[PDB]
């Protein structure tokens, strides 16, 4: 689509991890998507695998990294 009436636009975020728009509004957009998908089906087993993929997003909304230095962690 490159022509003389067209404009291409390439952007690189400085860091895709650890951006402000990725902590809260990215997890809670996916957890909401698995609430509307828990109503689509009827099994006790397709809901249960979709209540585990929701549980890994609740647990990653707060996280901690374990990096040691010297003798302290």
């Amino acid at each position: 689509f490159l022509s003389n009436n067209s404009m291409v636009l390439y952007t690189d975020v400085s860091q895709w991890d650890s951006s402000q728009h990725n902590t809260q509004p990215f997890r809670k957009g996916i957890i909401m998507g698995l609430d509307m998908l828990a109503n689509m089906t009827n099994d006790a087993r397709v809901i249960q695998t979709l209540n585990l993929y929701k549980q890994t997003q609740i647990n990653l909304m707060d996280s901690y990294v374990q990096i040691p230095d010297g003798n302290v962690i």
Partner: peptide, 13 residues
Amino acid sequence: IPTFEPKESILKK
């Protein structure tokens, strides 16, 4: 981390 509560409600079948 800044708190972000989106507008939603629970939906039952």
